[PDB]
Design a protein around this ligand. Sequence first.
Ligand SMILES: [Cl-]
Ligand SMILES: [Cl-]
Ligand SMILES: [Cl-]
Ligand SMILES: [Cl-]
Ligand SMILES: [Zn+2]
Ligand SMILES: [Zn+2]
Lengths: 113, 112
Amino acid sequence: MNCLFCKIAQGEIPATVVFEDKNILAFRDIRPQAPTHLLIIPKKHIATINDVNDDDSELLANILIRAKKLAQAEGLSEMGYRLVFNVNSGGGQEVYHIHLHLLGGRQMTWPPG
Amino acid sequence: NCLFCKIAQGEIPATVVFEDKNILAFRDIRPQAPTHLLIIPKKHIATINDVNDDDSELLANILIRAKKLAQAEGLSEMGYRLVFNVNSGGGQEVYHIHLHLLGGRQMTWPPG
Ligand SMILES: [Cl-]
Ligand SMILES: [Cl-]
Ligand SMILES: [Cl-]
Ligand SMILES: [Cl-]
Ligand SMILES: [Zn+2]
Ligand SMILES: [Zn+2]
């Protein structure tokens, strides 16, 4: 209830949508941590990676595949980019709807937080 | 000439934590967190930029295996972070795809 990303996926909160298909939505993170910072989400509400079982694992892989296609469309792939899933508070997750971060447009450094 | 192919096939030793016909997971020798695992396909794919839709089964296997390794390591609730570096600007140095699993401390923002 009151999931921010479900609200975005339902058109109830403004966002810059860069990709949509029947299952997946991608949009800009409002607090970008790199010159381009995108989020790729399932439209289905799944709280954390720990809640992805075998029946949602193809969807999760397809989020990753869409992120790599989107990185090309957005001009990030030639220089390079980083993909991040955060899981729970110790992993940095704040919104409890799974999201893949796509960060690029500068050199990404090590460690990754 | 691929370091991770050699590890996958047993030609170079590693601290292996999981192996099946498709995947190998091992401890990073320069760990950036108390838990720092690398999960690789045995199949050689050079970079995430080369992924195709026929990789969905293997990529799902890698991601689910990461979830399961996080559980066995004690990180499911404490929290953890999964990272792919893609090409030089993403921090990739070895051109065989590898998923980083990091946890056992607070992971911070930005993620590098
Ligand atoms: Cl796209
Ligand atoms: Cl085996
Ligand atoms: Cl597989
Ligand atoms: Cl395991
Ligand atoms: Zn949601
Ligand atoms: Zn290889």
